[PDB]
Amino acid sequence: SGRENLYFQGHMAAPARFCVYYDGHLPATRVLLMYVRIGTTATITARGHEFEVEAKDQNCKVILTNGKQAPDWLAAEPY
């Protein structure tokens, strides 16, 4: 916009505040695992595996603490 001196302010704090993890990607068959607070890490335990995940994004893009991406069967929906 050229020199339009808008005072920048990202006034939002995400519409999602939790993430709902499920076992399965299919919207009917996906089994509720647990809710995770966006802004924190959580250990999901499924299939005998522990997944330390970080709910970092409002899209509930699940990235694990070592930089791993989540299994395809591990679903997360923005809550």
Query: How far lies 18's CA from each of 40, 44, 79, in Å?
Result: 9, 14, 5
Residue of 22, 23, 12 whose CA lies nearest to 79: 22
Break the chain into its structural domains and give their ranges.
1-79
| The two structure tokens encoding residue 68 | 């791993």
Fill in the DSSP letter of residue 31.
E
Query: How far lies 36's CA from each of 3, 9, 73, 76, in Å?
Result: 42, 27, 17, 9
What's the alpha-carbon Rg for the chain, to the nearest Å?
16
**CA neighbours closer than 13 Å in the CB half-sphere of residue 45:** 1
What is the rounded CA–CA span in Å between residue 76 and residue 70? 10
All residues at 6 or more sequence positions from 38 whose CB lies less than 8 Å from its CB, including other chains: 14, 16, 17, 18, 19, 55, 56, 57, 58, 60
How was this one solved? NMR
